[PDB]
Amino acid sequence: KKPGASLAALQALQALQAAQAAKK
């Protein structure tokens, strides 16, 4: 099974979504 996103990986993704550089 795939383990879940860490608080560090969600913080990177929160930045890429705020950047519009990945879909929300």
Cα torsion 8, 10, 11, 13 to 10°: value is 130
Q: Could you tell me how far CA 17 lies from the centroid of its own chain?
A: 7
Q: How far is 17 from 1, CA to CA, in rounded Å?
A: 25
Experimental approach taken? NMR
Integer angstrom CA distances of residue 4 from 1, 12, 19, 20, 21: 9, 14, 22, 22, 21
Q: How far is 3 from 24, CA to CA, in rounded Å?
A: 20
Q: How far is 24 from 15, CA to CA, in rounded Å?
A: 11
